[PDB]
């Protein structure tokens, strides 16, 4: 089986080809390649709307959750990381909807994937249909850790605000969302935590440092204390 | 070569946010070969995590 054309067909977006390959051999619709991925996977990865939508029609009794690739990534996972609200809404509004909290091999939820990349719609959409804003991945990291890391106040005010997110949890390295949003130097972001969403800042990582000590550069640091 | 649209390299950096630019090169490179064997060009998360492992501590 070395080559899996149907999947390929999904990568290259040859809508017909696909519709033509399913015709010849039906057992392909739900076949898993050397990555544990089924067609739908790739048809979502590259955003093949027509192919996708179609592919689904014959997967309407198929639970997305039951199809995670070799990294626990589900066609709804790939969907959320990519950033297309449509494609996601597509995979969501169906008889059997996917678990918004199912994690991947390294335990990250679509909220992380979404937040990390900064997909406000996606992030928000999810939060609205459940999606725990508090799921720790194999690094004791929750979406806010991601949000602060990049530093989007926009998503910081969403997780912490609406999603009443916890803000003082520390990952493995022993870092609160604040350290992150300071090591990458997002002063304004850092302060928003402490200031608007009461984030403690006297804690120390698993080495003895506080958020101030693990800041990007002095320019950053100062702006912090000079405003906390 | 290139990263799969859904790849999540951020996750990889944000873990211990303190990696020498050289490991990044090694991590990134290893993840290239893993993707190579799977006879694919684009890189998946599988490759990266498996690269991060045999490349850090």
Experimental approach taken: X-ray
State how far the Cα of A51 lies from the Cα of A89, in Å rounded to an integer.
Answer: 16
Q: In whole angstroms, how far apart are CA A112 and each of A72, A116, A125, A144, B34?
A: 14, 6, 13, 8, 25
Tell me whether residues B10 and A108 touch, CB distance under 8 A. Answer: no
Among A102, A37, A35, CA closest to A67: A37
Q: How far apart are CA A9 and CA A19, in angstroms?
A: 9
Q: Which residue from A78, A106, A171 is facing B6, i.e. has the nearest CB?
A: A78
The verdict on A139 touching B (C-beta cutoff 8 Å) is yes
Q: How far apart are CA A113 and CA A78, in angstroms?
A: 9
**Hey, what domains does chain A have and what are their CATH numbers?**
1-228 (1.25.40.20)
CA distances B44 to A109, B25, B33, Å, are 17, 17, 11
- Cβ atoms of A129 and A92 closer than 8 Å: yes
A21, A56 Cβ separation under 8 angstroms: no
The architecture that CATH gives domain B1-57 is Orthogonal Bundle (1.10)
Of B17, B44, B46, the CB nearest to A183: B17
Q: How many CB pairs under 8 A join A and B?
A: 67
Which H or E run includes A116? helix A110-117
> How far does A61 lie from chain B, in Å, by closest CA?
25
Instruction: Give the residue from A81, A135, A183 with the most B CB atoms within 10 Å of its CB, the best one to mutate.
Output: A81
Structure tokens at A13: 């977006």
Instruction: Answer for the pair A147, A115: CB distance below 8 angstroms, yes or no.
Output: yes
Best residue of B3, B7, B9, B11 to probe chain A, by most A CBs closer than 10 Å: B11
CB-based contact A195:A160 (threshold 8 Å): no
Domain boundaries, chain B: 1-57
Cα separation of A145 and A163, whole Å? 14
Phi, psi of A132 (to 5 degrees): -55, 130
Residue of A nearest to B46 (CA): A71
């Amino acid at each position: 089986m070395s080559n899996y054309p149907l999947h390929q067909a999904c990568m290259e977006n040859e809508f017909f080809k696909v519709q033509e390959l399913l015709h010849s051999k039906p057992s392909l619709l739900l076949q898993k390649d050397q990555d544990g991925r089924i067609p739908l996977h790739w048809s979502v990865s590259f955003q093949a709307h027509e192919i996708t939508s179609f592919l689904l029609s014959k997967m309407e009794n198929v639970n997305l959750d039951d199809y995670p690739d070799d990294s626990g990534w589900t066609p709804f996972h790939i969907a959320c990381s990519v950033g297309n609200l449509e494609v996601v809404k597509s995979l969501y509004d169906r008889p059997l909807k996917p678990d918004l909290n199912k994690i991947t091999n390294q335990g990250v939820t679509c909220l992380h994937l979404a937040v990390g990349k900064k997909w406000f719609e996606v992030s928000q959409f999810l939060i609205e249909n459940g999606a725990s804003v508090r799921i720790k991945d194999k690094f004791n990291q929750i979406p806010l850790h991601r949000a602060a890391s990049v530093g989007s106040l926009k998503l910081i005010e969403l997780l912490c605000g609406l999603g009443k997110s916890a803000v003082n949890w520390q990952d493995k390295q022993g870092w609160t969302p604040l350290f992150h949003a300071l090591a990458e130097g997002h002063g304004d972001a850092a302060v928003l935590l402490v200031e608007k969403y009461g984030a403690e800042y006297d804690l120390v990582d698993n080495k003895g440092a506080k958020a101030e000590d693990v800041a990007l550069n002095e320019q950053v640091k100062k702006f912090f204390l000079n405003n906390v | 070569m290139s990263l799969a649209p859904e790849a999540d390299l951020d996750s990889l950096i944000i873990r211990n946010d303190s990696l020498s630019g050289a490991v990044i090169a090694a991590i990134m490179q290893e993840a290239g070969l893993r993707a190579v064997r799977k006879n694919r060009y684009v890189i998946l998360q599988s490759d990266l995590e498996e690269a991060y492992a045999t490349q850090v501590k």
